[PDB]
């Protein structure tokens, strides 16, 4: 509350550390469905159904330009990419499997870097 704060957790390396995680997600062999925005002209239904499209290149640009206020808003966008994927793709598809795999890969790196 006013003049009552928990001890100050050091957040000075968060930017650099999120950048490293995102590099690792970008270079994963199963990243290919997620590297670029879904083409809303060429994929029927996507625009209407997925209210908030997100992809790795859009996260990279937001990160590099100071549009994440803290590490939690970064994680929310990464999770949005996988939540979108699950909304549009059957589990038993190459893309649906890719999204599950990448979500796991991310959540481990997230815990090991910060928790």
Numbering used by the authors: 1856 to 1970
Task: Please share excerpts from the published article on this structure.
In this work, we show that unencumbered views of the changed, non-ground state can be obtained by recasting the problem as a multi-data set, 3D background-correction problem, which allows the relevant signal to be extracted from conventional single-data set density. Our new method—Pan-Dataset Density Analysis (PanDDA)—comprises: the characterization of a set of related crystallographic data sets of the same crystal form; the identification of (binding) events; and the subtraction of ground state density to reveal clear density for events. We demonstrate the power of the method by applying it to the most demanding type of changed-state study, namely crystallographic fragment screening, which attempts to observe in electron density the rare and often low occupancy binding events that occur when a relatively large (200–1,000) library of weak-binding ‘fragment' compounds (150–300 Da, 100 μM–10 mM)1819 are added individually or as cocktails to a series of equivalent crystals. Applied to a series of fragment screens, PanDDA yielded markedly more hits than manual inspection of density, far more quickly and all with high confidence, in both known binding sites and new allosteric sites.
